[PDB]
Amino acid sequence: FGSGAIGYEFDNRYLNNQEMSAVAKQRLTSLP
Amino acid sequence: FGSGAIGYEFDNRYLNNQEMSAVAKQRLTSLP
Amino acid sequence: FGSGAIGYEFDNRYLNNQEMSAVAKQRLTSLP
Amino acid sequence: FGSGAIGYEFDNRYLNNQEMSAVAKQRLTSLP
Amino acid sequence: FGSGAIGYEFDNRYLNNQEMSAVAKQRLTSLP
Amino acid sequence: FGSGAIGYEFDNRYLNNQEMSAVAKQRLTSLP
Amino acid sequence: FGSGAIGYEFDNRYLNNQEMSAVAKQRLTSLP
Amino acid sequence: FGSGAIGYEFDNRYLNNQEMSAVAKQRLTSLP
Amino acid sequence: FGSGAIGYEFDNRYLNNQEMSAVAKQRLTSLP
Amino acid sequence: FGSGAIGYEFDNRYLNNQEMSAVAKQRLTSLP
Amino acid sequence: FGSGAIGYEFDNRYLNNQEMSAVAKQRLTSLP
């Protein structure tokens, strides 16, 4: 059948947690 | 058939534990 | 057929052990 | 067919070894 | 059937988060 | 058909080696 | 059926992000 | 059909090599 | 059916990015 | 059909290379 | 059907890149 309001929010939340991991590897380094 | 109150709470809890891992990699670094 | 009291407790215990790994990566860091 | 006293104890033992790995990452850190 | 405006934006967002991980490994090193 | 005395001992030995890996990560740490 | 202008650009973008990871491991080392 | 003297010795040897990896992570640590 | 000018260039580009990762691990070491 | 003199020697060689990796992690440590 | 001059060269190139990774882990160490 079909209804995609919980498939959407779980997929949108998995890409959020994957994006959250990617921005936690960002470093503005502090050697010369 | 269908009933999704335990598929929801287990999927909502897996995205919670994945989010919990992503916020545990966050570091406000402390070199100049 | 169907009976889900051992599928539930094993899935609830796998999300517990996954949550337990996520809270073991948490560090309140101690440099300035 | 069906009999689940060895599927249970092997699944209960896999979640035990997964829990054992999660509690071996726990550290009460010892810097200020 | 077919409709691809949510398959597109989720695939476009997964390649964004994969690109975000790749640019977070870039280092302009600072030894001689 | 069925006979499970070699499926048991190989599954019991895989959970043993997985348990053996989990107890080899245990550390009683020795900083203050 | 067939149309491959979004399968192409997503595959071309995945190989781009994989190439981007490979050039971020390149180091011109600076010991003697 | 069936004959399991080479399936046994290859499975017994894979659990041996997995056990060999587990005992190579064991450390009797030597700080106070 | 068949046409392989985009399967070729994507496979040729994946082996290029895999080769690019392999040459980025090469180190002419600089201790005595 | 069946003939297993090249399936045997490739499986025997994969368990050899897996055993070779396990004995390369063995360390007789040299702190007190 | 069959033609294997592009399956060969892609498989020969994947084993080349896997061999290239293996020779990049080789170290003639330089402590006493």
Add this chain to the structure above:
Amino acid sequence: FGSGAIGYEFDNRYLNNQEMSAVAKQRLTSLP
């Protein structure tokens, strides 16, 4: 059908590259 002179040499070359990785982890350590 069957012909195995290119399946053999690719499998023999994959076990060679896996063996090559295993001998590159071998270290004759040089502390007391």
Add this chain to the structure above:
Amino acid sequence: NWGSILELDLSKVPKGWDVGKWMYYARVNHIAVIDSFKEGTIGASTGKLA
């Protein structure tokens, strides 16, 4: 020409004490009671500040 000037921070002068009477009793006794556990010093002790 003036003498040497000491630069003095008062972050450890204890609670409920004025800088006047605290310095007054240090003239006399040549001892100054301080507080290494003031709320102004929670940063360096907890690892949050330098």
